Design a protein around this ligand. Structure first.
Ligand code: CLA
Ligand code: CLA
Ligand code: CLA
Ligand code: CLA
Ligand code: CLA
Ligand code: CLA
Ligand code: CLA
Ligand SMILES: CCCCCCCCCCCCCCCC(=O)OC[C@H](COP(=O)(O)OC[C@@H](O)CO)OC(=O)CCCCCCCCCCCCCCC
Ligand SMILES: CCCCCCCCCCCCCCCC(=O)OC[C@H](COP(=O)(O)OC[C@@H](O)CO)OC(=O)CCCCCCCCCCCCCCC
Ligand SMILES: CC(/C=C/C=C(C)/C=C/[C@@]12O[C@]1(C)C[C@@H](O)CC2(C)C)=C\C=C\C=C(C)\C=C\C=C(C)\C=C\[C@@]12O[C@]1(C)C[C@@H](O)CC2(C)C
Ligand SMILES: CC1=C(/C=C/C(C)=C/C=C/C(C)=C/C=C/C=C(C)/C=C/C=C(C)/C=C/C2=C(C)CCCC2(C)C)C(C)(C)CCC1
Lengths: 163, 81, 89, 73, 41, 216, 742
C-alpha cells in the first residue's frame, strides 16, 4: 500500500511542479525528445525547415474547406494564398520576437544541465544568429509545405474522403 | 398453500440464512467481516442463551435477509418460468 | 519517476478478456455477438470504409455496452492484482 | 467587469497562468520580456469608465440616427 | 417585567409600532376621505 | 434473571426487574426530561393499571351479554359504544362531547392533584381540600400512596407480602397492556369483538387464526 | 456507545438578555459608539461558532434554530391552506378546471386597489396565483373547504409544537456533544424513518384515498356527489367497484401474488389523456418502491447491536497508488465541523432542486398542470433560482470551513492536502477551458451576427446554412424513445413525451406535451450553458482553494474569511478573500440562471405550448421562430425581449398593472445597486463629515457617530440590491407575459 506514482520534480520537493505519468513517461519523453524543437545539437535551420513544413502543410485544409470562396471554382487557390499569408505574418512575428529577445553578444539562455545532472552545451536556438537561422528555415519550409499540400490536393487529383 | 413452491422457497431461504448465521458461514453480531472477508471475532455486550453466540439480533437480521432473498427468488422464477 | 509506473503485468489483459467474454456471451442473441456481427457487417467493405452507421442503429448501444464492460473488467482486474500483493486487505 | 471586480482576484489568476506557461513543453521556448501583472486600481477605474462611456455614446448615437432616419419625420 | 419594558423600548420595536399606527391612521383617513387631490379649506 | 443482559443499573430492587432493556432507555448517565429513571417505572405502572381497567371493561359487557346479566342492547362490542362514532354509536343521557368535557374536568382534578403529589411529595395534604386532604397525603413512594382510601382494607402489612403484591401488580399490568394492544389489532383485522375472536379460535383453531383473516 | 445524553436546565428562561442587544458577542455587548455597531449586531447574530469555542453550545443552538425554522415553515403552510380555504375559488375550479383561473389572494378596497381583483371565473374576483396549490390539492383528493380549514388548524398546532420543542431542547433539556456525533445512528434513523416511512405513509394515502377520488373525478362525477374519503375505508365495496383487486384483501401481499394488485399498482409511462398528468397508479407503485428501498438502505450502518458498516473504516479502506493516504481523516472533519456538512448538504440540495425543475416540466405529475402554462413557467423558474442560490452557498460555507476549521496536523497526505498541493494546475486548466468555451460559443454567436448584418446568410451557423447538429443528444432521445420495446419491455409507453418517439396529448384544446426537436440552436445554447457553468465553478473553486494562502499573500488565513483587502501594496490587493470570490460567483450564477430560464421560456413558447383545433393542427404561441431567430444576439433582442415585453408594458389599467409597476421598480432597484457597486467608502465618509458639520451647527448631532458603510458591507449591499432588481424584473416580465398569453 506504500507504492506511489507521483513524485516531486526531479526529486526536489521545493521546485514548483510534479513529475507525473503525463510529464515523465518513456513514450511521452521519447516523443518529446525526438521532436525538432528539443534536438539541441542540430543546426537551427533544419529544425526550422521541418517545423515550417509541418505547420504550412497542416494550415492549408482549414482555409480551403472553410472560407469566403469555399463554394466557388477557385477555392483551393484562395485557401492556399490565405495559408501562405498566415505563414508570412508568423514569419514577421518570429523576426520581431528574435530582434526583441536576443542580442549579438549574449552566449545563450537555454539550460545546460540535464535531469541527471550532466553538463551539456546550451542550445544555439536561444541566440540572435540561431533564431535568425531558425526563422529563415521556418519561412522557407512553411512556403514549401503550403505548396506541397496545394499540389497534392488540386494539381493532382488524389481523391480524399473530404478533400 | 403449505406445500406450494413459494412456501418451500421461502422456508428454504430463511432456514439457509439462519443456518449460515448460527454457524460461522456468514457475518453476525459477534463475528465481523474484514476488508478481505475473513470473519474475525467481535465482542458485543449482548447476552444470549445460545452457546455458539447466536443472539436475537442475529435471528432478526438473518430472518430479514432470508425473507428478502426468498421474495426476490420467487418473483424472478415466476417472471422467467 | 519510476519507468514502470504502471507496474507491468501484461497478463491482466488475457484475464480481463476472458472474464468479459464469458458473461457477455451467455444470453440469447445478446452480448459480444452483436459487436462481432456488426464488425462483420461493415457494408460495402469491398474497398474501404462504408459510410458510418446512422443514429438509428443498435450498433452504437451494443458497442458502448461491450467496451464499457470490457474496460470495467480490465480495471477491476488490474486493481485485483498489484493490490493483493501491496496489501489493502 | 472593470468597474465591479477588483485587482487581487486577477493578480492571483495571472500567477496561476504564469506557472502554467513556464511548465508547458514547446512553449518554454518562448519567454516574455515583461512580467505580466494585473492592471492597477486607478488604471482599472479608468478603463472601466472608458468602456462605459464608449458604449453609452455608441448606443445612443445608433438609436438616435436610426430612429430618426427610418422615418425622416 | 422591567426587562420586557426595556426590550419593547428598542429602536426596531418602537419603529414598528409607530409606523404601524401611522399607516393605520393614513389608511383609515383615505377610507373615509378618499380621492383627495386639493385641500378644500 | 431472565430476558437480556444485566444492564448494571437494573440491579433488581425494582418489582418486576428482569434486566430487560435492549435499547438502554433507563441508563442513568444522561437522564433528563421524561426519560428519568424515577419516571419510567411510575409511567409503566400507570399505563399498566389503566390497561388492566381497559381490558376488563372492554371484555366484560360482551361476556355479560352472552351469559344474560345485562340487556342485549348494552352487550355491544367495545368499539361500538361511542369511542368511534363512524363504526358504531350508542345514545346516552348526554352527547359524547358533553360527556368528554365532564370527564376531562373530573380527571383534570384527579390527575393534576396526582401530578402535584409526584412533583411536590409532601403536598396535597396541606391546603384545605373539602375535608379530604387528611387522607390524601401520599406516604413515600409516589406510585404507592396508600392510606385510608387508596388502601382501605390493609393489604401488605408486612414488607414481604407487599413485595409479592407489587410483583403481581406489575405482571397483571404488563399482561393487560399486551391484551389491550391485541384488542386493537384484532378489532382492526376482524371487525368483531375479542370474545367472538376467542370463540372462533376455539371452534376451528386451524382455520380461524391470523393467517386466515389476512383478507378482511 | 449510542445512547441519549442530555443536560437538565442548562440555560435559564428570562427576558434579561432581550434588553442586552449584543449579549452574544463579547465586543458588541459593551454598547455602540458608531453606527457600525448596528450593522455588526445584525450581521453576527446567527454566526454561532464565532461567539464560543466549544462544539456543544454551537450544536445546541443549531438544533434549536432548526426547530424555529420548522415552526416558521409550518406557519407558512397553514397560511397557504387557510387562505385557500377562505379566499379562493377552489370549488368552482374543481367543477371546471380548464376555464376557471386559480385565485387565492383578495385585496381590500382602499386606494384604487380594486383593479387588481381580476375576473378569474367562478363568480370570484381575486389575484390569479401560479403556485400550483390547486393542482396539488386536487391530486390529494381534497374536494371541500372544510378539509383545507382542518389542515390549516393542524398546521398551526404543529407550529406551536415546533416552537415548544425548540424551547424545550435549548432552555430545558439540551443534548450533549456525544449525542450529535452519532452520525451512524442519525443516518440509520433518518434514512429509514424519515424517508422510507414517510414514502410508505404517502403511498398508503394515495392507494386508500387519492386513487378512487381522482378516478371518479376523471370519469365525470360531480365533485359534490363523490363519497368522502373515509367511505372507501369503511366500505371496501366501493373501492372494489373502482379497483376490483381490493376485494382480495391483503392475502396476495403475504402470499407473494403481487401480480393480483396490477390494476392499481401499474408501470405505465406517458400522461393521463383526460388530465395531462402522470397516472396515479404509477405514483403509488413508485412511492411504495421508494419506501421499500429506503427502508432496506437504512439498516446498513453499525450501532449498539453489532451488525452494520462503520463509516470510518470504509473511508480509511479506499485509497490507492495515485492519492497517497486517500480518504483518511475525512471522518473527523465531518464529525467535528458544522461548516463542511453545510457545504456538502447545500451543494446536494441545490443540484437536487435543479433536477426537480427539469423532471417536473418534462413529466408533469399533477392533473391539469401541464396545460396551465403560467404554473409550469413559475415553478421551473422558482426552483431553478433556489438551486442556484444553494449551490453558491455550498462554496461560501466550504471556504468558511477551510479558513476556520482546517487543521494541517490531521491532514498530512490525504486527498485534501494533495488537492491543496496541485491547485495551480487545476486553476490553469480550468481557466483554459473557460476561455475555450467562451470563444468557440459566443464567438459563434458574434460570427452569426456579423454574417447576418453583412448580407451573407449562407455563411452562418444555422440549420439552412452550415449546420452543427447535436448528434449525441439526438441519439439519446431516440434510444429513450424505443425503450418500451427492447430495454424496458414491461413499460407501456416511454418515460416522457419529450423524447422523439410518441404522440401529442391535448387537454381542453391546448397542448400538454409534445416531442421536442433538437437542432443547431439547441447545440449552441447548451454549449453556452456549459461555458457559464464552468466559469462560475472556476470562480468559486479559485476562492475555496486559495482561501488560506497564495504567492501574493502567504498568510491570508491570519486575516480571516471576510476581510476587505491587504492594502494598496504589491500593486493592489483588493478582493483577495474567499468572501469576495463568493461575491463574484453570485453575479455569474445570476448570469447563468437568467440564460437558462430565457432558453426554457422561448423554446417552450416556440415549440411545445400552443392551441390545437379540429383535425389536429397545432399553432404555437410564437410560431416556431426559435430555430431561426435564436442563432443571433439581435434575434434574441428583437424576437424575445422586445416582442414578449409588450404585455408587461401595456398592463396599465388592467388587473395586471401590478406586474408593470414592479417591472419598473425592479429596473429601478437594479440601477440603484450600481452606486454601491461602483463607488468607495472614503468619498461617502467625507460627505458624511460635511453633513455632520451641518447637523452640528444646529446642536442636533447624534450621540452615535454616523459612519459610512464598511467595504464588505458596501459590496454586500450592492450585490443584494442588484440580485433583487434583476430577479424581480424577470419575475414581472414572465408573469405578465404568460398570464396574458396563457
Ligand atoms: C439451527 C440454527 C439455530 C438458530 C437459528 C438458533 C437460534 C437461537 N437459539 Mg439455538 N441452538 C442451535 C441452533 C440454532 N439456534 C443448536 C444446534 C443448539 C444445540 C447446541 C442450540 C442450543 C440453544 C440453547 C441451549 C439456547 C438457544 C437459544 C437460541 C435463541 C437465542 C435468543 C437470544 O438472544 O436469547 C437471549 C435463538 C433464537 C437460547 C434461547 O433463549 O432459546 C429460546 C438458548 O437458551 N439455542
Ligand atoms: C433465481 C434467481 C433470480 C432470477 C432468475 C431473477 C430474475 C429477475 N429479476 Mg431478480 N432478484 C433475485 C434473484 C433472481 N432474479 C434476488 C436474490 C434479488 C434480491 C432480493 C433480486 C432482486 C431483483 C430486483 C430488485 C429486480 C429484479 C428483477 C428481475 C428480472 C430481470 C430484470 C433485469 O435484469 O433487467 C435488466 C436490468 C438492467 C440491465 C439494469 C428477472 C425476472 C427486476 C424486475 O423485476 O424487473 C421487472 C428488478 O427490478 N430482481
Ligand atoms: C481506421 C478505421 C477507419 C477509417 C479509415 C475510417 C474512414 C472514414 N470514416 Mg469512419 N468510423 C470508424 C473507422 C474508420 N473510419 C469507426 C470504428 C467508427 C465508429 C466510424 C464512424 C464514422 C462516422 C459516423 C462517419 C465516418 C466517416 C468516415 C470518412 C471521413 C473521415 C472516412 C472514409 C464519415 C463519413 O464520411 O461518412 C462519418 O460521418 N466514420
Ligand atoms: C467486474 C469484475 C470484477 C469484480 C466486480 C471484482 C471484484 C472484486 N475482486 Mg476481482 N478480479 C477481476 C474482476 C473483478 N473483481 C479480474 C478480471 C481479475 C483477474 C486479474 C481479478 C482478480 C482479483 C484478485 C487477485 C483479487 C480480487 C479481489 C476482489 C474483491 C475486492 C477487491 C476489489 O476489486 O474490490 C471490488 C470493489 C467492489 C466490488 C465495490 C464496487 C461497488 C460498486 C472484489 C469482490 C480481491 C479479493 C483479490 O485478492 N480480484
Ligand atoms: C412627493 C411625493 C408625493 C406626494 C406629494 C403625493 C401626494 C398625494 N398623494 Mg401620493 N404617492 C406617492 C408620492 C407622493 N404622493 C408615491 C411614491 C406613491 C406610491 C406608493 C403614491 C401613491 C398614492 C395613492 C395610491 C394615493 C395617493 C394620494 C395622494 C394625495 C394625498 C391624499 C390626501 O390628502 O390624504 C389626506 C391625508 C392627510 C391630509 C394627512 C393628515 C395628517 C394629519 C392628521 C393632519 C393634521 C396627494 C395628492 C391619494 C389620492 O387621493 O390621490 C389623488 C391616493 O389614493 N398617492
Ligand atoms: C375503564 C373503563 C371505562 C372508560 C369504561 C367505559 C364505559 N363502560 Mg365500562 N367497565 C369497566 C371499565 C371501564 N368502562 C370495568 C372494569 C368493568 C367491569 C366494566 C363493565 C361495564 C358494563 C357491564 C357496561 C360498561 C359500560 C360502559 C360505557 C358506558 C358507561 C356508563 O354508562 O357509565 C362506557 C364506554 C356499559 C356499556 O357499554 O353500555 C355497560 O353496560 N362497562
Ligand atoms: C441552510 C442554509 C444556510 C445556513 C444554515 C447558513 C448559515 C450561515 N451563513 Mg450562509 N449562505 C447560504 C446558506 C446558509 N447559511 C447560502 C445559500 C448562501 C449563498 C448566498 C450563503 C452565503 C453566506 C455569506 C456570504 C455569509 C454567510 C454567513 C453565514 C453565518 C451567519 C449568517 C448570518 O450572520 O445571518 C445574518 C443575516 C442577515 C444579515 C440577513 C441578510 C439577508 C451562518 C453560519 C456569514 C458567515 O459565515 O460569516 C463568517 C457570511 O458572511 N452565508
Ligand atoms: C404563551 C406562551 C409563553 C409566553 C411567555 C411566557 C413567559 C413566562 C415566564 C418566563 C420567565 C420565567 C422565569 C421567571 C424569572 C425571570 O424571568 O427572572 C427573575 C426576575 C426576578 O425579578 P424580581 O425583581 O422579582 O426579583 C429580584 C431578586 O433579586 C429578588 O427578588 O424576574 C421575574 O421574576 C419576572 C418574571 C416574568 C418576566 C416576563 C414578564 C412578561 C411575560 C409576558 C410578556 C407578554 C405579555 C402579553 C400579555 C397579553
Ligand atoms: C482520469 C484520471 C484517473 O484515472 O483518475 C482516477 C485515479 C484513481 O487513483 P487511485 O486508484 O490511487 O485512487 C484510490 C482512491 O483514492 C479512490 O478513492 O485518481 C487520479 O488519477 C487522481 C485525480 C486525477 C484527475 C485528473 C483530471
Ligand atoms: C393504557 C392502555 C389501555 C387503556 C384502555 C382503556 C382505558 C380502555 C377504555 C375503554 O375500553 C373501555 C374500558 C370501554 C370502551 O367502550 C371504551 C374505552 C374508552 C375504549 C394500554 C397500554 C399499553 C401499553 C403497551 C402495549 C406498551 C408496550 C410496550 C413495550 C412492548 C415495550 C417494550 C420495550 O420497552 C421495553 C420493555 C424495554 C426497551 O428497552 C425495549 C422495548 C422493546 C422498546
Ligand atoms: C427457541 C428455540 C429455538 C428456535 C426456534 C425457532 C423456530 C426459531 C426461528 C426463528 C425464526 C424463523 C425467525 C424468523 C424471523 C423472520 C423475520 C425477522 C422476517 C422479517 C421479514 C421482513 C423484514 C420482510 C420485509 C419485507 C421485504 C423486505 C419484502 C417486501 C415486503 C416487506 C416490506 C414485508 C432453538 C432451535 C434455538 C432451540 C429450541 C427452541
Amino acid at each position: 500500500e506504500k507504492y506511489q506514482v507521483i513524485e516531486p520534480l526531479n526529486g526536489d520537493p521545493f521546485i514548483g511542479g510534479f513529475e507525473t505519468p503525463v510529464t515523465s513517461s518513456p513514450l511521452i519523453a521519447w516523443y518529446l525528445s525526438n521532436l525538432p524543437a528539443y534536438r539541441t545539437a542540430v543546426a537551427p535551420l533544419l529544425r526550422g525547415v521541418e517545423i515550417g513544413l509541418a505547420h504550412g502543410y497542416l494550415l492549408v485544409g482549414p482555409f480551403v474547406l472553410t472560407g469566403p470562396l469555399r463554394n466557388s471554382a477557385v477555392r483551393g487557390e484562395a485557401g492556399s494564398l490565405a495559408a501562405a499569408g498566415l505563414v508570412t505574418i508568423l514569419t514577421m512575428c518570429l523576426t520581431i520576437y528574435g530582434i526583441a529577445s536576443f542580442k549579438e553578444g549574449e552566449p545563450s539562455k537555454a539550460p545546460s544541465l540535464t535531469l541527471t545532472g550532466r553538463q551539456k552545451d546550451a542550445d544555439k536556438l536561444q541566440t540572435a544568429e540561431g533564431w535568425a537561422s531558425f526563422t529563415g528555415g521556418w519561412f522557407f519550409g512553411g512556403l514549401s509545405g503550403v505548396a506541397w499540400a496545394y499540389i497534392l490536393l488540386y494539381v493532382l487529383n488524389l481523391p480524399y474522403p473530404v478533400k | 398453500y403449505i406445500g406450494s413452491s413459494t412456501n418451500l422457497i421461502m422456508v428454504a431461504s430463511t432456514t439457509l440464512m439462519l443456518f449460515a448465521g448460527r454457524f460461522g458461514l456468514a457475518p453476525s453480531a459477534n463475528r465481523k467481516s474484514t476488508a478481505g472477508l475473513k470473519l474475525v471475532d467481535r465482542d458485543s455486550g449482548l447476552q444470549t442463551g445460545d452457546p455458539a453466540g447466536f443472539t436475537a439480533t442475529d435471528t432478526l437480521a438473518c430472518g430479514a435477509l432470508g425473507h428478502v432473498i426468498g421474495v426476490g427468488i420467487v418473483l424472478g422464477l415466476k417472471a422467467t418460468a | 519517476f519510476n519507468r514502470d509506473w504502471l507496474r507491468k503485468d501484461l497478463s491482466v489483459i488475457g484475464f480481463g478478456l476472458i472474464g468479459w467474454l464469458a458473461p457477455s456471451s451467455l444470453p440469447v442473441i445478446n452480448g459480444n455477438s452483436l459487436t462481432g456481427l456488426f464488425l462483420g457487417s461493415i457494408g460495402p467493405e469491398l474497398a474501404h470504409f462504408p459510410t458510418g452507421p446512422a443514429l438509428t442503429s443498435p450498433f452504437w448501444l451494443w458497442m458502448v455496452t461491450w467496451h464499457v464492460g470490457l474496460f470495467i473488467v480490465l480495471t477491476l482486474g488490474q486493481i485485483g492484482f498489484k493490490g493483493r500483493q501491496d496489501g489493502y486487505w | 467587469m472593470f468597474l465591479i471586480s477588483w485587482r487581487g482576484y486577477w493578480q492571483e489568476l495571472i500567477e496561476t497562468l504564469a506557472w502554467a506557461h513556464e511548465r508547458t513543453p514547446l512553449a518554454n521556448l518562448v519567454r516574455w520580456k515583461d512580467k505580466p501583472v494585473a492592471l492597477s486600481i486607478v488604471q482599472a477605474r479608468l478603463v472601466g469608465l472608458a468602456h462605459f462611456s464608449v458604449g453609452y455614446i455608441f448606443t445612443y448615437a445608433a438609436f438616435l440616427i436610426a430612429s430618426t432616419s427610418g422615418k425622416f419625420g | 417585567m422591567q426587562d420586557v419594558k426595556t426590550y419593547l423600548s428598542t429602536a426596531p420595536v418602537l419603529a414598528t409600532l409607530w409606523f404601524g399606527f401611522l399607516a393605520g391612521l393614513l389608511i383609515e383617513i383615505n377610507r373615509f376621505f378618499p380621492d383627495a387631490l386639493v385641500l378644500p379649506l | 434473571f431472565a430476558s437480556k443482559q444485566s444492564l448494571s443499573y437494573l440491579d433488581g430492587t425494582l418489582p418486576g426487574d428482569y434486566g430487560f432493556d435492549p435499547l438502554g432507555l433507563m441508563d442513568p448517565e444522561g437522564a433528563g426530561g421524561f426519560i428519568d429513571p424515577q419516571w419510567l417505572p411510575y409511567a409503566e405502572i400507570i399505563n399498566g393499571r389503566f390497561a388492566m381497567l381497559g381490558a376488563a371493561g372492554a371484555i366484560a359487557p360482551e361476556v355479560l351479554g352472552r351469559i344474560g346479566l345485562i340487556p342485549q342492547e348494552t352487550a355491544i362490542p367495545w368499539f361500538q359504544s361511542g369511542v368511534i362514532p363512524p363504526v358504531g354509536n350508542y345514545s346516552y343521557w348526554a352527547d359524547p362531547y358533553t360527556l368528554f368535557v365532564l370527564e376531562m374536568a373530573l380527571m383534570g382534578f384527579a390527575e393534576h392533584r396526582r401530578a402535584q403529589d409526584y412533583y411536590k411529595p409532601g403536598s396535597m395534604g396541606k391546603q384545605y381540600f373539602l375535608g379530604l386532604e387528611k387522607f390524601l397525603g401520599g406516604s413515600g413512594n409516589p406510585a404507592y400512596p396508600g392510606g385510608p382510601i387508596f388502601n382501605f382494607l390493609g393489604f401488605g402489612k408486612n414488607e414481604k407480602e407487599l413485595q409479592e403484591l407489587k410483583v403481581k401488580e406489575v405482571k397483571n399490568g404488563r399482561l393487560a397492556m399486551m391484551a389491550v394492544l391485541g384488542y386493537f389489532t384484532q378489532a382492526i383485522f376482524t371487525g368483531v369483538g375479542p370474545f367472538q375472536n376467542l370463540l372462533d379460535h376455539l371452534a376451528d383453531p386451524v382455520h380461524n387464526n391470523v393467517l386466515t383473516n389476512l383478507k378482511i | 456507545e449510542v445512547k441519549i445524553m442530555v443536560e437538565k436546565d442548562p440555560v435559564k428562561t428570562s427576558f434579561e438578555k432581550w434588553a442586552k442587544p449584543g449579549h452574544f458577542s463579547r465586543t458588541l455587548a459593551k454598547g455602540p459608539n458608531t453606527t457600525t455597531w448596528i450593522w455588526n449586531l445584525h450581521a453576527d447574530a446567527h454566526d454561532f461558532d464565532s461567539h464560543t469555542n466549544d462544539l456543544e453550545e454551537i450544536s445546541r443552538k443549531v438544533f434549536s434554530a432548526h426547530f424555529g425554522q420548522l415552526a416558521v415553515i409550518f406557519i407558512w403552510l397553514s397560511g397557504m391552506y387557510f387562505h385557500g380555504a377562505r379566499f379562493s375559488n377552489y370549488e368552482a375550479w374543481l367543477s371546471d378546471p380548464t376555464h376557471i383561473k386559480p385565485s387565492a389572494q383578495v385585496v381590500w378596497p382602499i386606494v384604487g386597489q380594486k383593479i387588481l381583483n381580476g375576473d378569474v371565473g367562478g363568480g370570484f374576483q381575486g389575484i390569479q396565483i401560479t403556485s400550483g396549490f390547486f393542482q396539488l390539492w386536487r391530486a390529494s383528493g381534497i374536494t371541500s373547504e372544510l378539509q383545507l380549514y382542518t389542515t390549516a388548524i393542524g398546521g398551526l398546532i404543529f407550529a406551536a409544537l415546533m416552537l415548544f420543542a425548540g424551547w424545550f431542547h435549548y432552555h430545558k433539556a439540551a443534548p450533549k456533544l456525544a449525542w450529535f456525533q452519532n452520525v451512524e445512528s442519525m443516518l440509520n434513523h433518518h434514512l429509514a424513518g424519515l424517508l422510507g416511512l414517510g414514502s410508505l405513509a404517502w403511498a398508503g394515502h394515495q392507494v386508500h384515498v387519492s386513487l378512487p377520488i381522482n378516478r371518479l373525478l376523471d370519469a365525470g362525477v360531480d365533485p359534490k356527489e363523490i363519497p368522502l374519503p373515509h367511505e372507501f375505508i369503511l366500505n371496501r365495496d366501493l373501492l372494489a367497484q373502482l379497483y376490483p383487486s381490493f376485494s382480495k384483501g391483503l392475502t396476495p401481499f403475504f402470499t407473494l401474488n403481487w401480480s393480483e394488485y396490477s390494476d392499481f399498482l401499474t408501470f405505465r409511462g406517458g400522461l393521463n389523456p383526460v388530465t395531462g398528468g402522470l397516472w396515479l397508479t404509477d405514483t403509488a407503485h413508485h412511492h411504495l418502491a421508494i419506501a421499500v428501498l429506503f427502508l432496506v438502505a437504512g439498516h446498513m450502518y453499525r450501532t449498539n447491536f453489532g451488525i452494520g458498516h462503520s463509516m470510518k473504516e470504509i473511508l480509511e479502506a479506499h485509497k490507492g497508488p495515485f492519492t497517497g493516504e486517500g480518504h483518511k481523516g475525512l471522518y473527523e472533519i465531518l464529525t467535528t465541523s458544522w461548516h463542511a456538512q453545510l457545504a456538502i448538504n447545500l451543494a446536494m440540495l441545490g443540484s437536487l432542486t435543479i433536477i426537480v425543475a427539469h423532471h417536473m416540466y418534462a413529466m408533469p405529475p399533477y392533473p391539469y398542470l401541464a396545460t396551465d402554462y403560467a404554473t409550469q413557467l413559475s415553478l421551473f423558474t422558482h426552483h431553478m433560482w433556489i438551486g442556484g442560490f444553494l449551490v453558491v452557498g455550498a462554496a461560501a460555507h466550504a471556504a468558511i470551513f477551510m479558513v476556520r476549521d482546517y487543521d494541517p496536523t490531521t491532514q498530512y497526505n490525504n486527498l485534501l492536502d494533495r488537492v491543496l498541493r496541485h491547485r495551480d494546475a487545476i486553476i490553469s486548466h480550468l481557466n483554459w477551458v473557460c476561455i475555450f468555451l467562451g470563444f468557440h460559443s459566443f464567438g459563434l454567436y458574434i460570427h452569426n451576427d456579423t454574417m447576418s448584418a453583412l448580407g451573407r446568410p449562407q455563411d452562418m451557423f444555422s440549420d439552412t446554412a452550415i449546420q452543427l447538429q447535436p448528434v449525441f443528444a439526438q441519439w439519446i432521445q431516440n434510444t429513450h424513445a424505443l425503450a418500451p420495446s427492447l430495454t424496458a419491455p414491461n413499460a407501456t409507453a416511454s418515460t416522457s413525451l419529450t423524447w422523439g418517439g410518441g404522440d401529442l396529448v391535448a387537454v381542453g384544446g391546448k397542448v400538454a406535451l409534445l416531442p421536442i426537436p433538437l437542432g443547431t440552436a439547441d447545440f449552441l445554447v447548451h454549449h453556452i450553458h456549459a461555458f457559464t457553468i464552468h466559469v462560475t465553478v472556476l470562480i468559486l473553486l479559485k476562492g475555496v482553494l486559495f482561501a488560506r494562502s497564495s504567492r501574493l499573500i502567504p498568510d491570508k488565513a491570519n486575516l480571516g474569511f471576510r476581510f476587505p483587502c491587504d492594502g494598496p501594496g504589491r500593486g493592489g490587493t483588493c478582493q483577495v478573500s474567499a468572501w469576495d470570490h463568493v461575491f463574484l460567483g453570485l453575479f455569474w450564477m445570476y448570469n447563468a440562471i437568467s440564460v437558462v430560464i430565457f432558453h426554457f421560456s422561448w423554446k417552450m413558447q416556440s415549440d411545445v405550448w400552443g392551441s390545437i383545433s379540429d383535425q389536429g393542427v397545432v399553432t404555437h404561441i410564437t410560431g416556431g421562430n426559435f430555430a431561426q431567430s435564436s442563432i443571433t444576439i439581435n434575434g434574441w433582442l428583437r424576437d424575445f425581449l422586445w416582442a414578449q415585453a409588450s404585455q408587461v408594458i401595456q398592463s396599465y389599467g388592467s388587473s395586471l398593472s401590478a406586474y408593470g409597476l414592479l417591472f419598473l421598480g425592479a429596473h429601478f432597484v437594479w440601477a440603484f445597486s450600481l452606486m454601491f457597486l461602483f463607488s468607495g467608502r472614503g468619498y461617502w465618509q467625507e460627505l458624511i463629515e460635511s453633513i455632520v458639520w451641518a447637523h452640528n451647527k444646529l446642536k442636533v448631532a447624534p450621540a452615535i457617530q454616523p459612519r459610512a458603510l464598511s467595504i464588505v458591507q458596501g459590496r454586500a449591499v450592492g450585490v443584494a440590491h442588484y440580485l433583487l432588481g434583476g430577479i424581480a424584473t424577470t419575475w414581472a416580465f414572465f408573469l405578465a407575459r404568460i398570464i396574458s398569453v396563457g
